[PDB]
Amino acid sequence: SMSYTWTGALITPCAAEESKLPINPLSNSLLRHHNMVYATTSRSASLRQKKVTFDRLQVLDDHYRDVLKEMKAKASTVKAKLLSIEEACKLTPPHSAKSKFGYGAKDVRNLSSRAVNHIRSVWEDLLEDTETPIDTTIMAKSEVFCVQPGRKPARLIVFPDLGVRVCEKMALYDVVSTLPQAVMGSSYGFQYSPKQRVEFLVNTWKSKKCPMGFSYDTRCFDSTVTESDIRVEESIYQCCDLAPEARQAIRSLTERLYIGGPLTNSKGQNCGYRRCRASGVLTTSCGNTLTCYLKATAACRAAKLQDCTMLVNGDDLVVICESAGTQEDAAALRAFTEAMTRYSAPPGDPPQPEYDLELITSCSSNVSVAHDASGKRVYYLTRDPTTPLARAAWETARHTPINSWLGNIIMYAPTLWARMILMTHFFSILLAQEQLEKALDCQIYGACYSIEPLDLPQIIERLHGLSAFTLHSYSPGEINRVASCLRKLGVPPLRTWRHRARSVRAKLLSQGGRAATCGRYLFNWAVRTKLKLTPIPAASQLDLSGWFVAGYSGGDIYHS
């Protein structure tokens, strides 16, 4: 079937869409070349649509079915709790899209009788109507990036009403939170923190006689998801012990929402139909991981690859296996791609076999190596800093809802670039404006979290470990990448930053409390006359488990 059908109606913006970085004093400090940073707008909607509209090709075989059973077996062990309207309401973000029925996120969290009575009807409806397609909205996602030697057309997000969204939580939250792990096990990426992802990646890499690995970029994964897939996915969920209403709920959401449905724009006009994955639903991340894993696993067997270990995060896939030689591997990978193509998951960038782990890129990042105070190697997780910086600049000169810099600092706290640039910049700013003690919302694996800036040192140590404050001697590969990015964007050089940080540090010492703590641990690198860094008392009082349990991108989740 066609992934998308269009009536001709336009994908419209429900306000004003900014596209260029403002020339501001605070931002021009971080990076000068503002004319290299852009935000996607609905103006490029049509272009995306062309790229994401086509006819799927899907042929299944024994390997696929054999793997689907292996997976269903493990799912059977699961028992998923049915959330109550009240619990589901807790999970709704405060910034979540308002309903088309007289209420928004705020009311939902407050349990407003109106918001709640409506949610009930939507539920009662799901249990009664097992066929009527459910409406969804189609918008142009606004994201910021850096120009490439054209530009990236905005991504399109499809999502149902807030009422429907709260019900999805009731029936499938516990499911999409425990099942993917019970099925894929150590291969489920969202269960790991940055430290753990690295551990798993080098531990897997070193467990092979002669390792070979590759990342696999599926071309617009969401559009390749077929009605067949969405149902196979449902069969897996159906293996869970479920409460009657939940089972009926899943059956209906599958047919009415997940496999497809009408598309309405912000103006109420009909846009077309969707016969693929809905990026903005609760089951997106879970289902994409399950589908990707299923196919890739089956593809490995079809391709005769040896001892394949998968690490899947949604549609993001990386594979480490036993090398059979340069020619044998290149032939096998090629077969793998063909098998994946028949499973309706064609490549965008033909997969290239890598023999140097640091060269493999999964979830837009890679495993690199640095050294602790003792000079002992300390493997860690990094990534090109171009996008994080473009967004950083952007977020500085524009009030953004989800500060992605806070998050980027947490996730990449031990990297060269996050420590030298991000930590420095944002703090001297927070301090200058005296915002050191303000809770800010940021994201981690799709879920929205409220974070207090000064609690960073604990968080960092608890997630990464003290070594994150003393790492040095980053590989030459890493340096050259941070070098080019900074050059390209017109970012101040190392010497400039050290001086700035050299100042922010002392700026922080003279205040004590958690503040002086930050200056002491975060900017240790700054001074040559260091300071022995010991375990932070408050580090052991942080329950960051919920932070790394499952994926929720587009799932509209908010962990209180």
Ligand SMILES: O=C(Nc1cccnc1)c1cccc(Oc2ccc3c(c2)c(=O)ncn3Cc2c(F)cc(F)cc2F)c1C(F)(F)F
């Ligand atoms: O800025 C540089 N080059 C440039 C700048 C502008 C235009 N074109 C090129 C530039 C110039 C020379 C070296 C360099 O890399 C660096 C910078 C600091 C380094 C290392 C390499 C290292 O191997 N080992 C330790 N440190 C010290 C260090 C650290 F352990 C942690 C930090 F939190 C900050 C910091 F200092 C850079 C880099 F892109 F910043 F990364």
Ligand SMILES: [Mg+2]
């Ligand atoms: Mg965990």
Ligand SMILES: [Mg+2]
């Ligand atoms: Mg892709």
